[PDB]
């Protein structure tokens, strides 16, 4: 019997839909499989420990834990209550600052076994920059945009906004490279509306990035795997105005869905995940495919896209959980084989 | 006083160099203005703090070690034993266990002020098919490479081989993607070599780059800053073969150094670094430059390459670790000004 920890809440405010998230996997663990214990994180970064989770929680209240296993960090995620180490601990919050890659980086150099994606993947994903040069350089087709940092805007400000004008139609976003779902983006439809935008953003982060605006349908893929993964069939998120409603299988044409299941893959592969990403597109009326973005950590409740997404293809709430700690042994079992390997020819 | 510590030591291969650098850092830490307590990770793991360092380390013995304080992760890593927070953590290692970046998050959950590379950066960095697009994006030159999985290699090795012979000229260097320096590299002449170091590789890593290697001068540059970094003019190892004297600047024409100071800017921002960055190029007989890497952690004793580097543009050893002390302390203090102002809407 394997020991599991699931780690959530978080100091951003994302407290609750973690909360909620936990909840949903915590019920959808079968227990004579799975030893588990939680860990949650307040909004304090107060760390609180509940062992051996043993029944339905029929509540999210439940989980505002009051009280901790008293233990240090470091104790409370290098064994389980069962006193072995976790075969696999679920980060399913962001970084204390929203950030992602943070906790993954902590499990590391804790050595302990984690879901998900790592250090590189998780941080690529959650700096849009980043991503999109990724995704460029995989061949991914993308909406134009331009990017800088606040030092670059500083000094070429006429030239930056000749840049727009040249090569961006309005509207277009002026979004933060570096937060996930948050402020600082504003849609403009004009140079004044950009200007207004751009300042709005740099007090939030350093870098920017600006991108053409599109009518088009939300949809989403989910991959799971770490060296050979798969793609679902896309899923839709119907909305009449864009500023979960979801539609599954997405109502799009075979060789459509088949070539974003492909990009699914190559979005995955661009930005190095392990485990899972959900990968988001635009499509236009007339079936353009632009990536979005990937989301190296997506909803994830049983009503969820991701986890809906799986049922469809046959896979279950509970088989897609037990199929993600397996990954997650597996990728930890071959970083430290592959550890074994190198200090070998070293030695 | 401010309060500082250094990390160091550390189950990496690496351990040793680590040891040293933690004591040239140390003897350029001037006592009377910092408090500074520092911590040794064990090859087995394990971190042992010792407080106080209050005079100079004329020998690795007079450092405890693996008999410091054991010392359990916790919010405590912020504090200092003078019972003030630490105003700057060197992270004097690599990754422990994984890639680098990984103490840097350790870092960033506990709100521990640190020097250098962010997550990001130190991560991207240890990854040089992530550091390649990145710096193709940016528009740095690079020498031409090919890059794959495994799993592509497994299902797609004609191809492969194919894309080689026609876009790289031989030789080409067969690199693991991930891990710096280390096992697995093969210099190959031909295509049953290369399916060879290929083949080698792949028992160390899952991602490989191809490169076309080339005849050149290595040439290095340090940057230091975060939003307003500034490069040094570059500098070389003194050697009359390319297949530890340095000289500083480098014997390059005036209009070469300058591009190449410009060009580790770049590099900087491509990687989005924090603190520092030693930007490593090729340069060629006809002064063609090639960015061959960013190193988010360079050799950092007194005599190499990154601090003498800054030697010649008048900023001395301690001066160095001081600007880099405060550099964490504005960055971290812009972190902490920027999380407010996200999580007041
Ligand atoms: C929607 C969130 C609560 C945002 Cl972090 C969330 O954590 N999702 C999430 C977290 C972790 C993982 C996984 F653990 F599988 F890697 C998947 C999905
Ligand atoms: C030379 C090493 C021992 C290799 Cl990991 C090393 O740690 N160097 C190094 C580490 C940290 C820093 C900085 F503190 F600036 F981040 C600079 C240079």
Same mark, same amino acid.
């Given at each position: ?6 780690? &959530? ?13 936990? /909840?949903?996997?915590?019920?959808? $663990? @079968? ?9 949650? $994180? ?24 009051? !009280? ?6 470091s104790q409370l995620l290098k064994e389980s209550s069962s006193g072995q180490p976790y075969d696999a601990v679920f980060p399913l919050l962001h970084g204390p600052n ?5 906790? /993954? ?11 998900? !994606?790592? #250090? ?51 509207? #277009? ?24 935008? $751009?300042?709005?953003?740099?007090? &939030? @982060? ?19 795997? !770490? ?10 998120? #119907?909305?009449?105005?864009? &500023?979960?409603?979801?539609? $599954? ?18 979005? &995955?592969?661009?930005? @190095? ?6 990968? @988001? ?16 950590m997506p909803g994830f409740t049983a009503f969820s896209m991701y986890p809906k997404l799986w049922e469809n293809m046959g896979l279950s709430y509970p088989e897609l959980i037990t199929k993600l700690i397996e990954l997650a042994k597996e990728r930890h079992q071959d970083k430290q084989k592959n550890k074994y390997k190198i ?5």
């Open positions: 019997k394997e020991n599991i920890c699931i780690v &959530f809440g978080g100091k951003s405010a994302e407290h609750e839909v973690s909360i909620l998230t936990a /909840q949903n996997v915590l019920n959808a $663990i @079968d227990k004579d499989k799975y030893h588990v214990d939680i860990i949650y $994180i307040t909004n304090d970064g107060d760390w609180r420990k509940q062992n051996n989770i043993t029944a339905e929680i029929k509540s999210t209240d439940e989980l505002h834990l009051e !009280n901790g296993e008293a233990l240090e960090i929203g950030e992602d890659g943070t906790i /993954q980086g902590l499990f590391e150099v804790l050595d302990v076994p984690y879901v998900g !994606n790592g #250090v590189l993947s998780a941080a690529s994903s959650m700096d849009k920059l980043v991503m999109k040069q990724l995704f460029e350089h995989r061949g991914l087709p993308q909406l134009p945009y331009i990017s800088f940092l606040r030092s670059e805007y500083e000094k070429y400000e006429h030239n930056i906004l000749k840049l727009v004008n040249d090569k961006l139609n309005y509207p #277009v976003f002026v979004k933060p490279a570096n937060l996930g779902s948050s402020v600082g983006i504003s849609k403009c439809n004009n140079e004044a509306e950009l200007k207004e935008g $751009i300042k709005e953003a740099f007090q &939030f @982060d350093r870098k920017l990035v600006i991108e053409q605006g599109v009518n088009a349908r939300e949809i989403e893929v989910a991959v799971l795997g !770490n060296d050979y993964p798969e793609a679902t069939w896309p899923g839709e998120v #119907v909305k009449d105005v864009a &500023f979960v409603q979801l539609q $599954i299988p997405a109502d799009l044409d075979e060789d459509v869905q088949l070539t974003l299941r492909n990009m699914a893959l190559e979005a &995955f592969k661009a930005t @190095d995940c392990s485990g899972l990403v959900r990968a @988001d597109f635009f499509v236009t009326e007339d079936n353009q495919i632009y990536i979005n973005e990937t989301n190296a200090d070998r020819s070293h030695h």
